[PDB]
Amino acid sequence: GSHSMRYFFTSVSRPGRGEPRFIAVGYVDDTQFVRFDSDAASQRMEPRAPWIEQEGPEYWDGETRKVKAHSQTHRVDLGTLRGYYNQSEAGSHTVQRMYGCDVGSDWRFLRGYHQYAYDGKDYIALKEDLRSWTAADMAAQTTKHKWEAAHVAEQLRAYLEGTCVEWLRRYLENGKETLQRTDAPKTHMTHHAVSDHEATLRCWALSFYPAEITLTWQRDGEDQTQDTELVETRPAGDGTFQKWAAVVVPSGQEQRYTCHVQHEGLPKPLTLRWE
C-alpha cells in the first residue's frame, strides 16, 4: 500500500528553569524508529526500531548533528515568537513542527508536507505544491514574507521530493518484516446489563496494524450515532493497536444491532452481532 515518513518536533520554553525542552521523534507509518530528547543522557539521535540499529556510525553522527541543528533553530524561534506576539518571559510556550513525505503503492512520491504550530494552533504551513506558504495569522505573515523572499521552500521541496522518498524506500526495504505487514484486528463483543431495561454492547478490535480502523454500529442496517461511544485508537505497546465502540440498547433488542469493522488487513469488512 502507500507509506509515509514523518518527523515530529516539540519545543517547550522553561522560564526561569534554563534551556527549552526539545524532543524529536521519527516514524515510518505507525512505527517509531528514532528519537532525540534534550533531557536524556546520550545527547545523540538514538534508535527505536531494530531495523535502524544496523545503520553505521556516519548515519548516527550525521543525524545527531542535524537534530542538534533543529534544536538550535527551535531555541531561537521561541524567542522570536515571544517577540512577535509581545509575550512576557514569565510564561511557557510551545513550538511544534512536523514534516515528511507520502509515497504510493509504487513507492513513488505522492505528497510532502511541513507544518509549524505555536501554542497548539497552526502558525505556518507549506502548501501542497511545495512552492509557497500558508500563514495562519498576521504575525505568521511576517514569516511567510521572509521565507518567500529568501526562497526557503526550494531546498525543502528538494528534500521532500528526493531525500525523504529515497530514505523512506530504504527503510521500508531494511525493515520490511516490521513495516510491510498488516495485522488484521482480532474482534469480539461484550454484553453488560446497565439496568433492568438496558444493556451495553461493546465491539472490540485488538492486535491490529496499522492504526487506521473504522468501527461503526448499525441498528436494523441504519447507521447508528445515537449513543455510540468511541474511544481513541490506542497502542497496545507491542507494535499493535486497540479500539472499541459501544452502544446502549434496550434489553431484548440486542439482535437488531451490528458492529462493522473496516481495516486494511481484512479481505472483507467484518460484521458482529450479539447472538
Binding site: 518527523y7 524529536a24 521519527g26 548515519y59 550525521g62 543525524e63 542535524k66 537534530v67 541543528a69 533543529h70 533553530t73 531561537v76 524561534d77 522570536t80 515568537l81 512577535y84 514534516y99 509549524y116 514569516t143 521565507w147 529568501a150 526557503v152 531546498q155 525543502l156 528534500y159 531525500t163 525523504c164 530514505w167
Partner: peptide, 9 residues
Amino acid sequence: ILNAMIVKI
C-alpha cells in the same frame, strides 16, 4: 533521515 537545512522564523 532528517532534513539538513532548518531555517529560523
